[PDB]
Amino acid sequence: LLEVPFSARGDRIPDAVAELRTREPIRKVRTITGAEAWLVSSYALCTQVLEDRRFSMKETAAAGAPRLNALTVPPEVVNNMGNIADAGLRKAVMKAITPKAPGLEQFLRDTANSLLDNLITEGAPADLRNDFADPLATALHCKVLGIPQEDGPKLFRSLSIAFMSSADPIPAAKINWDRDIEYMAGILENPNITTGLMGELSRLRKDPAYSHVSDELFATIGVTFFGAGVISTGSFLTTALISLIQRPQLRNLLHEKPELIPAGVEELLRINLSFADGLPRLATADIQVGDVLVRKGELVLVLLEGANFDPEHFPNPGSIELDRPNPTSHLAFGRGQHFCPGSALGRRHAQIGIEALLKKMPGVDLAVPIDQLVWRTRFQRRIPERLPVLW
Ligand code: HEM
Ligand SMILES: C=C[C@H](c1ccc(-c2ccc(O)c(Cl)c2)cc1)n1ccnc1
């Protein structure tokens, strides 16, 4: 039985995806746990699954369910956004993580420029993942959360385990989770934390309108939004920089006309291979998806690059075109009930990071042949362990 995932490489889509999409856009596969699942790979069927709440994220955590991979958080945290919504916290969380917070964008620009100046001083080769994209993501999320910048690196170092895609429970994930929760709980008790997401959660925790909300949920919001935001923005920016480096004509165009960078980033989102696995959902009813009657209790995997390279929806899907008529209609941020709450922040992180890099390093190029990149395995993102560049 066809095994998923197909390839940990984030620099090229396997030819097999287009064949599946054409012939079998919903197809039985085996996951790393040995479970069977339905892999959905067309824009039409991916959108159908993501927009039908009977394909449940929450129920993927149920004991005894077929699993894509092992939990790395407590099972109730899989329903984190539902818990946030039920607690009356959605609006406050969203307001806290907007890129338009006063001074946030300038902080992003200043941080990016400082990171780049240090790389220039040290001399090529430079590692754009470990010494640019990931520190930029980490610094951004410390600022957004309102926590000390110097605490970023230790929180960041949880994530190479936190976002593993493992067949089995990971003992280090429990250690790191418990430690990171204790940290966020202490932050909520720290009177000096008055800004950002944790400053606002700290205030709401003392507000009688929220007296019922548990300390557990407040700390969980901090751990989950830091982890999801840092891994997603650092990994997306890293692999978008590869796509851009691979396209010198586009790199030069965006350097010459940086007002096109938002359109460029939107296409880089569309062609991004950062998510290593399909998005998992558990059927809570018998539901017809294409030619397959998915049965209650079965696992469905929504393959984002299946949708995003679907030529019916995005003609010439492998080409970056800055004037498509349907440019934000990709699924890079998901779709439906679980659409990424951080989407605007993720866009802005990448836009500013790329703007800064192109100004400082207009000649940026890989310093090794592209096949020498080392792609992280058994992880929820596809990323190169190092991204060596020259300029
Ligand atoms: C370019 C950057 C990002 C990408 C590509 C991305 C991608 C995604 C995708 C595809 C989903 C849907 C998962 C699903 O439906 O199963 C998602 C959800 C989520 N994202 Fe993002 N994300 C990014 C940035 C962020 C940021 C900056 C934050 C927070 C600061 C964040 C926090 C979350 C959370 C908490 C969820 C879960 C939502 C829910 O369960 O309803 N993400 N993200
Ligand atoms: C399913 C939840 C997933 C998520 C997974 C793992 C973590 C995590 C963070 C720090 C840790 O120390 C450990 Cl061990 C785990 C956080 C979040 N997620 C993705 C978007 N929203 C939530």
Side-chain angles (χ1 to χ4, degrees):
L1 182 57
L2 184 60
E3 289 157 306
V4 289
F6 302 143
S7 173
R9 286 183 70 157
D11 60 331
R12 65 205 289 114
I13 191 172
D15 288 351
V17 177
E19 313 163 349
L20 263 194
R21 188 191 302 106
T22 296
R23 295 304 180 92
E24 300 177 274
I26 175 162
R27 164 75 148 91
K28 198 83 116 126
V29 297
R30 190 179 304 288
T31 78
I32 61 167
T33 70
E36 303 188 4
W38 297 108
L39 185 68
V40 181
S41 59
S42 66
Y43 190 93
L45 298 188
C46 286
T47 52
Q48 181 191 339
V49 172
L50 290 178
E51 292 188 333
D52 183 346
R53 289 181 174 108
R54 297 174 302 165
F55 294 108
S56 170
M57 170 186 287
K58 172 182 167 167
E59 294 299 341
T60 66
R67 299 203 66 74
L68 169 64
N69 56 29
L71 293 170
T72 68
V73 299
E76 67 275 14
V77 174
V78 170
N79 198 36
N80 186 47
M81 275 297 332
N83 300 326
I84 294 169
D86 294 345
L89 292 172
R90 185 189 275 283
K91 296 194 177 189
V93 169
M94 289 302 290
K95 175 180 183 155
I97 65 173
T98 177
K100 290 308 195 212
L104 186 57
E105 295 162 287
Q106 186 57 39
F107 173 83
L108 256 180
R109 187 172 290 107
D110 290 341
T111 302
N113 285 332
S114 180
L115 288 167
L116 290 163
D117 291 335
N118 291 349
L119 297 177
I120 289 169
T121 298
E122 185 64 23
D127 179 350
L128 291 187
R129 179 175 81 89
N130 292 292
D131 298 326
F132 178 63
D134 281 348
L136 186 63
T138 297
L140 175 57
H141 284 79
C142 290
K143 183 63 108 189
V144 164
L145 261 68
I147 60 176
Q149 291 286 315
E150 68 176 1
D151 294 353
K154 180 61 180 292
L155 292 169
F156 170 80
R157 279 189 295 272
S158 296
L159 301 180
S160 66
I161 287 162
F163 282 89
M164 280 178 171
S165 186
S166 179
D168 295 304
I170 309 169
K174 176 162 168 58
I175 295 172
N176 287 346
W177 175 262
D178 287 348
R179 185 186 66 244
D180 290 344
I181 288 285
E182 291 307 302
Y183 171 84
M184 291 298 172
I187 282 292
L188 293 157
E189 286 283 301
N190 182 339
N192 301 334
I193 304 298
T194 62
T195 74
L197 172 63
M198 300 314 286
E200 178 65 15
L201 293 181
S202 185
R203 276 189 297 276
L204 299 172
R205 179 164 173 270
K206 308 170 190 94
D207 182 334
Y210 303 83
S211 62
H212 52 298
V213 182
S214 73
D215 290 353
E216 192 168 284
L217 181 56
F218 286 119
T220 298
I221 295 168
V223 173
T224 59
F225 273 67
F226 183 92
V230 172
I231 204 66
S232 298
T233 61
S235 302
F236 169 62
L237 178 54
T238 295
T239 46
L241 289 169
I242 295 168
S243 287
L244 190 56
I245 288 170
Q246 282 170 311
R247 289 170 174 82
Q249 198 185 328
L250 177 62
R251 174 203 71 172
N252 292 337
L253 173 61
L254 299 183
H255 174 246
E256 167 77 2
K257 299 186 180 217
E259 71 268 20
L260 299 181
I261 288 173
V265 167
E266 210 61 38
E267 279 288 271
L268 290 161
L269 282 161
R270 182 179 66 74
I271 68 158
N272 100 78
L273 300 176
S274 68
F275 274 66
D277 309 296
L279 303 181
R281 298 292 192 268
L282 208 78
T284 65
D286 291 355
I287 302 167
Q288 189 77 33
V289 181
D291 296 332
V292 167
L293 179 63
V294 178
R295 303 294 306 258
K296 183 177 188 290
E298 289 183 338
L299 177 62
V300 178
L301 304 173
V302 180
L303 189 72
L304 295 183
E305 67 266 45
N308 287 340
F309 290 73
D310 186 331
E312 305 316 311
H313 193 81
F314 295 120
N316 202 350
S319 174
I320 289 184
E321 303 181 356
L322 307 178
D323 54 4
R324 289 180 183 280
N326 56 353
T328 63
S329 73
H330 59 74
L331 305 194
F333 294 119
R335 176 70 73 86
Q337 175 180 322
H338 297 288
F339 183 85
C340 179
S343 70
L345 188 64
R347 282 189 177 105
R348 208 72 189 104
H349 172 267
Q351 291 167 3
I352 292 172
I354 288 162
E355 286 173 39
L357 172 81
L358 291 179
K359 185 154 182 59
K360 294 271 180 192
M361 293 180 173
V364 63
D365 189 16
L366 293 176
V368 303
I370 192 155
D371 284 357
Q372 293 306 115
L373 297 183
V374 177
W375 291 95
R376 185 171 294 182
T377 53
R378 298 186 186 79
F379 200 67
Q380 294 175 38
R381 299 292 184 279
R382 301 183 184 116
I383 44 167
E385 290 286 350
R386 295 155 295 284
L387 178 48
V389 306
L390 51 71
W391 57 89

